[PDB]
């Protein structure tokens, strides 16, 4: 759900679009995530590992 579960009813939303929202919230455009999605995913997986 993202952040909607803590401010009211839960709203379904894809995780990449939630990441795009979180990147746009700090000033970074959504294109760098919708284009370089595999790199961000691999970096996140490497960090989790």
């Amino acid at each position: 759900s993202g952040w909607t579960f803590g401010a009211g009813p839960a709203l379904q939303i894809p995780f990449p679009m939630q990441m795009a929202y979180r990147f746009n919230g700090i000033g970074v455009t959504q294109n760098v995530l919708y284009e370089n999605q595999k790199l961000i995913a691999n970096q996140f997986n490497s960090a989790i590992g």
Partner: peptide, 19 residues
């Protein structure tokens, strides 16, 4: 490079006024 994009058309606020 975008994964999950579909084909669609966008509108132009200049073409109908110019043509």
């Amino acid at each position: 490079v975008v994964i999950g994009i579909v084909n669609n058309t966008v509108y132009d606020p200049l073409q109908p006024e110019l043509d």
